[PDB]
Amino acid sequence: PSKLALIQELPDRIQTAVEAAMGMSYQDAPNNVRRDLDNLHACLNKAKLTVSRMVTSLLEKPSVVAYLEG
Amino acid sequence: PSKLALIQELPDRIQTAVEAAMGMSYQDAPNNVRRDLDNLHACLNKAKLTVSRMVTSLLEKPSVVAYLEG
RNA sequence: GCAUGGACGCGUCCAUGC
RNA sequence: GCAUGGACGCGUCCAUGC
User: Region entry RNA-binding: which residue ranges (chains A, B)?
Assistant: First the structure.
């Protein structure tokens, strides 16, 4: 796994790590708990988008990409 | 995989997703790049902590645990 | 100068638990 | 009050692009 490979795969992996939890069903959950599980969803989503943004941000930096290329 | 388990295994799942990347070394890169990679490390470490804290917050709620299993 | 990304600081608000 | 998440405001630092 190349240094550039590690970074290019982070977003995918984070997705994999989170899917199970997010894809959970709580349709029958009480109100307060529902509010909590929605919040969890928001949290996981923000985490995921934030890591994605950072990766994208990184690959656009020519200087960084050169280093991850030799 | 019970619902309560999907929340309990989030941290371990994220560790698996991230450990590789936030474990790579780059002491040989120029300052600007080394600095950009530390930023990545900081980003990842924070998302990792955010998930753990949320998972903890959920698990400390009688309501959520009670519902997560009936 | 403008914009983007991240980290951080101070604060306002919302939810949930105690 | 404290904890955790989320939205938002102002500011700091780092990096890149224009």
Answer: 1-70
